[PDB]
Amino acid sequence: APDTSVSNKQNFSTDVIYQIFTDRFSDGNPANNPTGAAFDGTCTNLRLYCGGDWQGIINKINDGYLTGMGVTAIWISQPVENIYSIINYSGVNNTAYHGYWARDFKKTNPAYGTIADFQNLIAAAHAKNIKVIIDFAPNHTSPASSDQPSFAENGRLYDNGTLLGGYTNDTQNLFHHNGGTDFSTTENGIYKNLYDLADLNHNNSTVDVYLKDAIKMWLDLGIDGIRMDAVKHMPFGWQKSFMAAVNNYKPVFTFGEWFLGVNEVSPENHKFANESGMSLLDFRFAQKVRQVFRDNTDNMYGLKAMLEGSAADYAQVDDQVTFIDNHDMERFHASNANRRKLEQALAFTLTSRGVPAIYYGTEQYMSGGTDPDNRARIPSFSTSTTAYQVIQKLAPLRKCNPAIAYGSTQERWINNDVLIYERKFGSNVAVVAVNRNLNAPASISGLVTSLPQGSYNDVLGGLLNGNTLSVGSGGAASNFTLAAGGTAVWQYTAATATPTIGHVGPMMAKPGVTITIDGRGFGSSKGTVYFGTTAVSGADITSWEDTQIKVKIPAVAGGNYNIKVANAAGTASNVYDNFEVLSGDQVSVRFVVNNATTALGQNVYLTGSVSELGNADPAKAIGPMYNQVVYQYPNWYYDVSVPAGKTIEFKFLKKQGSTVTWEGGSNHTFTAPSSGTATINVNWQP
Ligand SMILES: [Ca+2]
Ligand SMILES: [Ca+2]
């Protein structure tokens, strides 16, 4: 099918996701309502159980509210069974209405619905061209206390009914026991508890296997995507082996939550997004958009710079999940005023790079503070709101215009309160002019674009005070007046001649796995897929359309490659870099090194005989390794996803500045496991 089909689990750029907090959306079946002190019919107490369930969600689907909006995907609350306990925090009673306090990843939450209810959810949505993304929190279980078993549910972890263990008396070692986290360091915040949430020990074979088994169950259910929780509070090494597990099996678009504060740029966030095998939330995009349209703590210059920087930092920026607000921030809309700001941001976000998300109720101009004041129940389902329209107008541009789903981003006109950017993909253009100044009308002159010559009517139909554009020869738009707080969208579409790739996914898998190349001008006739230098043609190319191709990863050596297509004729497309062919199925193995003394700025990295280990390249070495929590310096440690059932030769190195000091002697060798975790404790060879 076309890259624009509901069937495409690997691509989400052309969609518009709608983030729904299940319990605060629609109550379609009163039956599953929690009782007693855990329920609040009125939803007046934003910390109890309101009644939101899968049923209600289906009800909004077939009723037109969702589809009307032009929404194409829904990311819901964690489907899994949560704890029933009614925890009390310094007086206030709380619940797992949020869906993060899990007890059993193999069962559903009765409140949300039953397996059937869920399956009904997947079928109801699929029937309408709506994708389904589920939240999955493999980080912790629930709140617990080592010294107090009776509190809550002792972070107990079940396995489809059969009790695995609990925080207290963790003899199996399913959990971590290094106290809570202070967020001081990336390492510290991984191996230590988050508040009171009993951290899971993925280093345990029992926990690693089980979790990789829970997601599959959901996989086989119908989900078209996952939303990893606390991707920052989980061992990067282990996450990659998780992704490897999903990919090598039933690949699906996966993104995670790596919070970012105002003006916050983490080189670590980039590396995770780039190499993990999954995208992340675009806090970088979101944080700035707010400073530019809501709190106004930066100008369009701050906006442009972000757009540019981000574009080079993330290897697959067209994979980041953009938004203006969510569960972890207050509502973009200030009760106080000017809704035009929200709408401008809304306009901004849906016509920009990446996959746009929309927090439920945003189209209703919802207020509130930080959680729980940002999870109130949707106050109405009216389709007359200007924000619903705006979404209803620009949303489908991701499906109809490719420059918007795969285009690039270039500034073309800008000052303090104005920004005129253009998306460009093949012979597809689109220019979005935005005037944030709410008190003045901007006068633009000298604006140049890629649009052909002719008139261009504002897609928004003057909805945001946007005008019709007059583009003369050369692409030199006439002198027009951008209305105050105005917003306009002119675009140009056209058949694309040469093969152009706009997407690839999964971006990480072993040989045999089937990838989904997306773009335009591939031709209706089967061609050939090049994986670096190796070609792919014939029966190994499961499918070929003008928009999307489906080939099987060739039997090549694990490592980074380039994807490039050549239509039946022989014409070579554009190159798509950063594809990782794994040496095979993966496992999470923790590496240990003794007496690795060092000096300031000098750290320890790990390299090895596998692509997964950097193939001996020091530029591609693993680390810097950790050395404070689990193990203490001079002992260094690190969790690395390695090829399963393979004899590996490794050697440690130390780096300080650009200078590398190698380990002495011959490589240490060991044999990774064909399943589960494993630890390798060795000593530094002088
Ligand atoms: Ca209900
Ligand atoms: Ca953790």
XYZ file of C-alpha atoms and ligand atoms in Angstrom:
688
model
C 0.000 0.000 0.000
C 0.924 3.655 -0.262
C 3.238 5.192 2.328
C 0.136 7.156 3.367
C -1.668 3.969 4.400
C -2.871 3.015 7.884
C -0.968 -0.199 7.280
C 2.398 1.532 7.605
C 3.526 0.839 11.163
C 7.080 2.080 10.418
C 6.223 5.626 9.328
C 4.354 8.325 11.278
C 5.599 11.535 9.688
C 2.444 11.817 7.568
C 0.223 11.400 10.604
C -1.016 13.675 13.355
C -0.999 11.946 16.717
C -3.590 12.693 19.396
C -2.316 12.004 22.921
C -5.175 10.727 25.081
C -5.065 10.174 28.821
C -7.542 7.285 28.739
C -9.139 7.976 32.102
C -9.784 11.648 31.255
C -11.389 11.286 27.830
C -14.678 9.381 27.473
C -16.538 6.920 29.764
C -18.315 4.602 27.305
C -18.983 1.768 29.732
C -19.910 2.456 33.361
C -19.496 -1.227 34.135
C -15.701 -1.102 34.435
C -15.804 1.931 36.728
C -13.662 1.558 39.819
C -15.648 1.775 43.042
C -15.305 3.262 46.510
C -12.534 5.686 47.412
C -10.785 5.201 44.084
C -13.521 6.685 41.941
C -14.825 10.218 41.393
C -17.715 10.383 38.914
C -17.517 14.168 38.566
C -13.805 14.002 37.899
C -13.596 16.932 40.306
C -10.711 15.366 42.181
C -8.044 15.140 39.486
C -6.247 12.390 41.377
C -8.927 9.708 41.645
C -10.441 7.461 38.924
C -12.710 9.281 36.473
C -13.985 6.356 34.389
C -12.272 6.922 31.030
C -12.056 3.631 29.127
C -11.293 2.143 25.710
C -15.009 1.907 24.953
C -15.576 5.646 25.202
C -12.603 6.148 22.907
C -14.184 3.940 20.264
C -17.351 5.916 20.771
C -15.531 9.138 19.840
C -13.991 7.447 16.808
C -17.157 6.254 15.080
C -18.966 9.415 16.132
C -16.766 11.680 13.999
C -15.141 13.896 16.637
C -11.682 12.360 16.143
C -11.730 11.704 12.395
C -13.360 15.071 11.739
C -10.397 16.769 13.378
C -8.254 15.045 10.786
C -6.364 13.086 13.436
C -4.685 9.931 12.100
C -3.149 8.250 15.163
C -3.919 7.828 18.859
C -1.365 7.307 21.606
C -3.200 5.948 24.678
C -2.443 5.178 28.305
C -0.528 1.990 29.145
C -2.853 -0.901 28.407
C -1.326 -3.148 31.068
C -2.816 -3.986 34.484
C -2.003 -1.459 37.200
C -2.012 -1.685 40.978
C -5.352 -1.420 42.750
C -4.099 0.083 45.996
C -5.195 3.573 46.938
C -1.881 5.121 47.961
C -1.958 8.169 50.228
C 0.669 10.877 49.968
C 0.919 13.161 52.981
C -2.879 13.173 53.041
C -3.966 13.119 49.391
C -5.237 9.818 47.985
C -3.795 8.834 44.589
C -4.346 6.090 41.992
C -2.896 4.348 38.940
C -5.454 6.139 36.816
C -2.418 7.433 34.981
C -1.341 3.922 33.996
C 2.319 3.900 35.090
C 2.115 1.892 38.300
C 2.161 -1.543 36.701
C 1.769 -4.880 38.424
C 1.373 -7.127 35.414
C 2.503 -6.287 31.866
C 0.734 -9.402 30.586
C -2.795 -8.387 31.588
C -4.966 -5.351 30.788
C -6.372 -2.793 33.208
C -9.965 -3.762 34.017
C -10.828 -0.096 34.239
C -9.587 0.622 30.721
C -11.219 -2.566 29.491
C -10.666 -6.220 28.637
C -8.487 -7.881 25.967
C -11.538 -8.033 23.757
C -12.288 -4.389 24.485
C -8.764 -3.611 23.384
C -8.982 -5.712 20.245
C -12.231 -3.884 19.547
C -10.277 -0.671 19.961
C -7.664 -1.651 17.397
C -10.334 -2.727 14.923
C -12.487 0.337 15.439
C -9.564 2.661 14.824
C -8.034 0.727 11.953
C -11.388 0.826 10.187
C -11.094 4.592 10.109
C -7.429 5.018 9.101
C -6.337 5.779 12.682
C -3.124 4.299 14.090
C -2.667 3.208 17.711
C 0.389 4.024 19.828
C 0.593 2.590 23.338
C 2.512 3.740 26.384
C 4.856 1.116 27.827
C 6.733 1.638 31.091
C 9.397 -1.031 31.563
C 11.291 1.240 33.962
C 9.554 0.633 37.275
C 6.508 -1.155 38.638
C 4.723 0.787 41.350
C 5.458 2.744 44.502
C 7.097 0.723 47.285
C 9.063 0.649 50.523
C 11.749 -1.890 51.333
C 11.113 -1.659 55.067
C 7.324 -1.620 54.641
C 5.725 -4.479 52.739
C 2.194 -3.430 53.667
C 2.521 -0.105 51.834
C 0.741 -0.063 48.476
C 1.569 -3.322 46.729
C 5.267 -3.604 47.534
C 5.999 -2.881 43.879
C 5.071 -6.515 43.233
C 5.658 -7.772 39.696
C 3.328 -10.449 38.423
C 3.534 -12.592 35.328
C 0.044 -13.122 34.026
C -1.206 -13.951 37.522
C 1.810 -15.862 38.820
C 3.625 -13.647 41.365
C 7.244 -12.989 40.366
C 8.397 -10.953 43.344
C 8.117 -7.693 45.247
C 10.446 -4.965 46.502
C 10.696 -6.402 50.023
C 12.801 -9.544 50.215
C 14.108 -9.141 46.675
C 16.238 -12.271 46.778
C 15.792 -12.888 43.077
C 17.026 -9.374 42.540
C 14.252 -8.311 40.202
C 14.737 -4.749 41.475
C 17.425 -2.216 42.285
C 18.321 -1.374 45.872
C 20.609 1.640 45.672
C 18.228 4.196 47.149
C 16.409 6.872 45.153
C 17.815 9.283 42.556
C 18.783 12.920 42.953
C 19.132 13.413 39.205
C 22.706 14.527 39.746
C 24.130 12.372 36.955
C 22.819 10.339 34.014
C 24.179 7.207 35.663
C 22.792 7.974 39.115
C 19.313 8.545 37.666
C 19.376 5.140 35.933
C 20.389 2.697 38.618
C 18.533 4.459 41.408
C 14.805 4.656 42.077
C 12.656 7.475 40.691
C 10.996 8.873 43.831
C 9.448 5.732 45.345
C 8.998 3.733 42.144
C 10.663 0.318 42.537
C 13.292 0.270 39.794
C 13.387 -2.891 37.673
C 16.730 -4.637 37.274
C 16.942 -5.411 33.558
C 20.296 -7.078 34.280
C 18.298 -9.961 35.664
C 17.543 -12.690 33.102
C 14.094 -13.185 34.620
C 13.141 -9.527 34.144
C 14.803 -9.118 30.746
C 13.091 -12.132 29.223
C 9.696 -11.384 30.756
C 9.602 -7.772 29.540
C 10.678 -8.704 26.033
C 7.807 -11.173 26.180
C 5.187 -8.728 27.392
C 5.638 -6.314 24.505
C 5.295 -9.124 21.995
C 1.926 -10.075 23.402
C 0.867 -6.494 22.779
C 2.670 -6.562 19.459
C 0.563 -9.479 18.245
C -2.479 -7.564 19.472
C -2.520 -4.796 16.851
C -0.550 -1.782 18.154
C 1.070 0.343 15.449
C 3.560 2.050 17.785
C 4.975 2.362 21.314
C 5.682 5.265 23.687
C 8.593 4.385 25.965
C 8.432 5.910 29.443
C 11.552 7.202 31.168
C 13.932 6.305 28.350
C 16.400 8.420 30.315
C 16.047 6.364 33.490
C 16.832 3.098 31.715
C 20.169 1.623 30.668
C 20.803 2.729 27.093
C 22.512 -0.581 26.402
C 19.474 -2.580 27.464
C 17.040 -0.411 25.511
C 18.807 -1.142 22.241
C 18.495 -4.875 22.868
C 14.820 -4.246 23.548
C 14.404 -2.401 20.267
C 16.402 -5.153 18.616
C 13.816 -7.576 20.023
C 10.852 -5.618 18.696
C 12.468 -4.869 15.350
C 13.776 -8.318 14.476
C 10.211 -9.496 15.185
C 7.248 -7.172 14.502
C 8.740 -3.720 13.833
C 6.750 -0.639 14.860
C 7.429 3.080 15.185
C 8.920 3.660 18.663
C 9.548 6.965 20.465
C 10.558 7.797 24.048
C 10.372 10.453 26.746
C 13.616 12.315 27.464
C 12.563 15.507 29.220
C 14.297 18.767 28.325
C 14.082 22.081 30.156
C 14.043 25.551 28.635
C 17.233 26.210 26.666
C 18.272 22.652 27.449
C 20.438 20.807 24.924
C 21.879 17.419 25.836
C 24.461 15.880 23.529
C 23.396 12.658 25.221
C 19.802 13.042 24.111
C 21.056 13.258 20.536
C 23.089 10.061 20.760
C 20.182 8.142 22.233
C 17.764 9.273 19.554
C 20.314 8.621 16.841
C 21.583 5.179 17.897
C 19.001 3.686 20.287
C 16.780 2.508 17.449
C 13.965 4.791 18.527
C 13.070 8.474 18.313
C 12.304 10.776 21.241
C 9.898 13.498 22.324
C 10.854 16.862 20.948
C 11.252 18.896 24.099
C 13.800 20.896 22.180
C 11.076 21.835 19.732
C 8.392 22.185 22.379
C 10.388 24.241 24.883
C 11.335 26.884 22.331
C 7.918 27.062 20.691
C 6.609 28.051 24.109
C 9.241 30.726 24.635
C 8.361 32.083 21.221
C 4.549 31.864 21.207
C 3.451 31.569 24.847
C 5.765 33.008 27.488
C 7.732 34.956 24.947
C 11.227 34.489 26.390
C 12.952 34.365 23.004
C 12.375 35.574 19.443
C 12.033 34.024 16.004
C 15.822 34.021 15.946
C 15.731 31.597 18.824
C 13.130 29.706 16.794
C 15.204 29.580 13.614
C 18.391 28.569 15.373
C 16.578 25.724 17.071
C 15.120 24.541 13.792
C 18.575 24.529 12.228
C 20.531 23.083 15.123
C 18.068 20.265 15.725
C 18.121 19.498 12.008
C 21.777 18.512 12.170
C 21.941 17.074 15.672
C 19.348 14.346 15.186
C 20.228 11.862 12.439
C 16.524 11.311 11.793
C 14.954 14.594 12.890
C 12.008 13.640 10.733
C 11.310 11.080 13.452
C 11.122 13.234 16.561
C 7.676 13.623 18.134
C 6.882 17.360 18.234
C 4.301 19.035 20.443
C 3.502 22.261 22.267
C 2.465 20.643 25.518
C 1.841 17.369 27.283
C 1.404 15.488 30.545
C 4.709 16.789 31.917
C 4.025 20.509 31.401
C 1.191 22.942 32.139
C -1.425 23.678 29.490
C -0.192 25.906 26.684
C -3.376 27.883 26.976
C -3.374 30.444 29.717
C -6.828 30.949 31.207
C -5.852 34.559 31.055
C -5.729 35.257 27.325
C -5.119 35.300 23.576
C -6.020 31.974 22.038
C -4.425 33.157 18.822
C -1.136 32.193 20.439
C -2.257 28.582 20.883
C -3.531 28.461 17.318
C -0.346 29.928 15.894
C 1.652 27.347 17.739
C -0.797 24.705 16.558
C -0.428 25.986 13.001
C 3.316 26.001 13.529
C 3.643 22.440 14.839
C 1.574 20.555 12.213
C 3.410 21.994 9.203
C 6.886 21.499 10.614
C 9.446 18.655 10.436
C 8.809 15.455 12.389
C 5.667 13.745 13.765
C 3.249 16.128 15.516
C 1.387 15.105 18.656
C -1.677 16.817 20.128
C -2.583 16.575 23.809
C -6.293 15.844 24.295
C -8.456 18.924 24.873
C -5.941 21.229 23.177
C -8.549 21.918 20.525
C -10.833 23.006 23.349
C -8.515 25.582 24.844
C -7.826 23.827 28.123
C -6.076 25.441 31.058
C -4.504 23.969 34.192
C -1.198 23.767 36.019
C 1.421 21.061 36.328
C 0.079 17.524 36.941
C -2.469 16.746 38.080
C -4.076 20.041 37.015
C -3.268 19.230 33.375
C -5.210 15.978 33.132
C -8.761 17.168 33.701
C -11.514 15.491 31.693
C -12.195 16.926 28.213
C -14.870 19.583 28.937
C -16.742 19.177 25.669
C -16.641 17.645 22.220
C -17.563 20.653 20.126
C -16.349 20.859 16.542
C -16.975 24.609 16.291
C -13.760 25.665 18.016
C -11.235 27.594 15.930
C -8.488 25.286 17.167
C -10.380 22.197 15.991
C -10.786 23.779 12.585
C -7.144 24.783 12.331
C -6.204 21.152 13.005
C -9.002 20.039 10.705
C -7.445 22.156 7.955
C -3.679 21.657 8.103
C -3.570 18.082 9.445
C -4.185 16.234 6.174
C -1.414 18.217 4.531
C 0.955 15.576 5.851
C -0.807 12.989 3.713
C -1.428 15.138 0.627
C 1.805 17.183 0.461
C 5.114 15.321 0.805
C 7.244 18.386 1.422
C 5.440 18.613 4.734
C 6.067 15.021 5.773
C 9.588 14.705 4.380
C 10.510 18.179 3.202
C 13.459 20.110 4.574
C 13.213 23.388 6.458
C 14.646 26.712 5.368
C 14.103 30.215 6.719
C 13.225 32.728 4.006
C 11.944 35.812 5.796
C 12.419 36.785 9.413
C 12.639 39.527 11.990
C 11.644 39.618 15.656
C 7.968 38.695 15.408
C 7.934 37.141 11.932
C 8.903 33.853 10.316
C 8.348 32.589 6.784
C 9.629 29.085 6.356
C 9.364 26.724 3.440
C 9.176 22.958 3.357
C 10.659 21.351 0.248
C 10.440 17.747 -0.938
C 10.942 16.934 -4.610
C 8.549 19.125 -6.578
C 6.496 19.745 -3.471
C 6.654 23.074 -1.695
C 4.797 24.866 1.063
C 5.370 28.242 2.675
C 4.024 29.100 6.103
C 4.163 32.746 7.158
C 3.740 33.520 10.851
C 3.358 36.863 12.608
C 3.515 36.449 16.383
C 3.217 40.189 17.027
C -0.355 40.410 18.219
C -0.549 44.194 18.042
C 1.040 44.914 14.674
C 0.649 43.966 11.030
C 3.954 43.088 9.355
C 5.035 44.431 5.969
C 7.000 41.841 3.992
C 9.138 42.703 0.985
C 11.804 40.736 -0.860
C 10.553 37.313 0.158
C 11.665 34.592 -2.256
C 10.304 31.052 -2.541
C 10.313 27.831 -4.566
C 6.648 28.092 -5.536
C 6.043 28.496 -9.258
C 4.537 31.681 -10.653
C 0.825 32.198 -10.058
C -1.597 32.929 -7.235
C -1.731 30.873 -4.054
C -4.719 30.789 -1.735
C -4.191 30.514 2.006
C -4.873 26.872 2.892
C -6.226 28.082 6.218
C -8.790 29.991 4.183
C -7.950 33.253 5.921
C -8.882 31.477 9.172
C -5.820 32.842 10.968
C -5.986 36.162 9.149
C -3.723 34.759 6.392
C -3.741 36.245 2.876
C -3.521 34.982 -0.703
C 0.026 34.976 -2.080
C 1.190 36.384 -5.395
C 4.404 34.721 -6.589
C 5.923 36.164 -9.751
C 8.667 34.814 -11.997
C 11.810 33.725 -10.169
C 9.755 32.977 -7.066
C 9.776 36.610 -5.956
C 6.549 37.090 -4.025
C 4.872 40.469 -4.323
C 4.816 42.941 -1.454
C 1.966 41.996 0.839
C 0.958 42.801 4.393
C 1.001 40.019 6.946
C -1.891 40.679 9.319
C -1.135 41.083 13.026
C -0.909 37.698 14.718
C -1.675 36.438 11.231
C -0.901 32.952 9.932
C -0.988 31.707 6.342
C -0.135 28.591 4.355
C 0.454 28.474 0.614
C 1.669 25.268 -0.994
C 2.515 23.699 -4.310
C 2.256 20.025 -5.229
C 3.418 18.168 -8.333
C 4.394 14.741 -9.630
C 8.025 13.951 -8.751
C 10.199 12.498 -11.557
C 13.280 10.884 -9.997
C 13.166 8.498 -7.054
C 13.272 10.465 -3.803
C 13.450 8.873 -0.372
C 11.715 10.614 2.501
C 11.784 7.819 5.056
C 13.159 4.464 6.144
C 12.090 2.213 9.007
C 12.932 0.360 10.983
C 16.337 2.020 11.119
C 17.873 -0.911 12.954
C 17.606 -4.629 12.316
C 19.442 -7.821 11.450
C 19.576 -9.459 8.039
C 16.258 -10.879 6.881
C 14.188 -8.229 8.626
C 11.934 -6.309 6.218
C 12.305 -2.515 6.018
C 9.883 0.032 4.540
C 11.441 2.684 2.288
C 9.083 5.630 1.802
C 9.212 8.507 -0.683
C 8.134 9.530 -4.172
C 8.911 8.694 -7.786
C 9.897 5.074 -7.248
C 7.896 4.049 -10.300
C 5.342 1.238 -10.484
C 7.977 -1.137 -11.832
C 10.212 -3.107 -9.469
C 13.773 -1.765 -9.347
C 16.799 -2.318 -7.098
C 17.770 -1.389 -3.511
C 21.448 -0.706 -2.756
C 22.659 -1.349 0.881
C 25.925 0.572 0.718
C 27.442 -1.200 -2.273
C 25.348 -4.365 -2.190
C 22.294 -4.535 -4.427
C 18.847 -5.961 -3.797
C 16.536 -6.985 -6.590
C 14.045 -9.617 -7.644
C 12.171 -11.704 -5.093
C 14.054 -10.177 -2.164
C 12.008 -7.058 -2.770
C 8.662 -8.060 -1.293
C 6.949 -5.005 -2.858
C 7.361 -1.876 -5.001
C 5.186 1.202 -5.323
C 5.761 4.771 -6.420
C 5.539 5.842 -2.788
C 6.789 2.915 -0.726
C 9.064 -0.089 -1.194
C 9.470 -3.151 0.988
C 12.694 -5.127 0.756
C 14.381 -7.711 2.971
C 17.674 -6.787 4.679
C 20.370 -8.554 2.682
C 22.827 -11.007 4.204
C 25.483 -8.393 4.951
C 27.909 -7.652 7.760
C 26.589 -5.854 10.821
C 27.322 -2.130 10.643
C 26.250 1.283 9.339
C 25.042 1.448 5.719
C 23.362 3.734 3.185
C 20.022 3.155 1.502
C 19.660 4.287 -2.117
C 17.064 3.238 -4.685
C 17.130 2.968 -8.461
C 13.833 2.867 -10.348
C 13.321 0.155 -12.999
C 14.963 2.515 -15.481
C 18.173 2.695 -13.478
C 18.028 6.184 -12.011
C 19.648 6.544 -8.572
C 17.706 8.282 -5.788
C 18.958 10.256 -2.817
C 21.087 8.593 -0.133
C 19.614 7.777 3.274
C 22.367 7.340 5.875
C 22.532 5.724 9.298
C 20.992 2.285 8.741
C 22.209 -0.257 11.276
C 22.387 -3.909 10.250
C 22.869 -5.844 13.481
C 25.152 -8.882 13.529
C 22.033 -10.784 14.607
C 19.565 -11.119 17.483
C 20.606 -9.239 20.619
C 21.136 -9.612 24.358
C 21.982 -7.149 27.146
C 25.379 -7.915 28.716
C 27.007 -5.833 31.445
C 30.762 -5.398 31.031
C 33.053 -5.025 34.047
C 36.677 -3.836 34.283
C 38.950 -3.890 37.377
C 41.848 -1.666 38.447
C 41.154 0.799 35.662
C 42.822 3.716 37.395
C 42.761 7.013 35.514
C 43.233 10.783 35.680
C 40.834 13.725 35.253
C 39.056 14.015 31.899
C 40.354 10.509 31.255
C 37.691 7.819 30.970
C 37.202 4.183 29.997
C 35.586 2.906 26.823
C 34.916 -0.561 25.449
C 35.522 -1.798 21.892
C 35.254 -5.212 20.198
C 35.182 -7.655 17.268
C 31.538 -6.806 16.554
C 29.891 -3.916 14.748
C 27.798 -3.577 17.881
C 31.077 -2.940 19.701
C 32.483 -0.486 17.159
C 34.439 -3.105 15.183
C 37.704 -2.066 16.850
C 37.309 1.560 15.843
C 38.206 3.876 18.726
C 36.109 6.656 17.287
C 33.177 4.319 17.740
C 34.112 3.073 21.211
C 31.504 2.355 23.875
C 31.171 4.640 26.869
C 32.407 6.536 28.675
C 31.689 3.755 31.159
C 29.970 4.219 34.507
C 31.833 3.798 37.836
C 29.821 5.115 40.831
C 26.609 3.224 41.618
C 26.538 -0.466 40.636
C 30.324 -0.678 40.725
C 32.817 1.821 42.130
C 35.979 3.184 40.533
C 38.499 1.986 39.832
C 35.861 -0.548 38.697
C 34.057 0.485 35.513
C 30.832 -0.954 34.113
C 28.477 -0.623 31.166
C 25.510 -2.420 29.648
C 25.921 -3.243 25.986
C 23.610 -4.859 23.479
C 25.608 -7.569 21.730
C 24.990 -10.228 19.125
C 23.497 -13.365 20.720
C 25.373 -16.707 20.716
C 28.629 -15.156 19.483
C 32.249 -15.405 20.580
C 33.417 -11.847 21.200
C 36.905 -10.417 21.461
C 37.180 -7.156 23.343
C 39.723 -4.709 24.734
C 39.375 -1.604 26.881
C 40.886 1.786 26.251
C 41.237 5.058 28.081
C 40.739 8.477 26.565
C 41.594 11.956 27.768
C 41.177 14.699 25.250
C 41.766 13.147 21.835
C 44.496 10.835 23.170
C 43.931 7.079 23.365
C 45.860 4.647 25.566
C 45.108 1.021 24.708
C 44.917 -2.005 26.971
C 48.028 -4.152 27.044
C 48.144 -7.799 25.959
C 45.750 -9.723 23.698
C 41.960 -9.296 23.635
C 39.741 -10.698 26.374
C 37.269 -13.153 24.896
C 33.909 -14.466 26.005
C 30.724 -15.959 24.663
C 27.543 -13.946 24.801
C 24.323 -15.728 25.656
C 21.734 -17.000 23.208
C 19.110 -15.585 25.557
C 18.818 -13.349 28.608
C 21.420 -11.162 30.287
C 24.992 -11.854 31.301
C 27.876 -10.231 33.123
C 31.553 -10.207 32.206
C 33.947 -9.214 34.940
C 37.522 -8.855 33.796
C 40.631 -6.954 34.824
C 42.698 -4.290 33.128
C 45.625 -5.851 31.294
C 48.671 -3.589 31.601
Ca -15.640 3.235 32.557
Ca 15.710 2.338 35.916
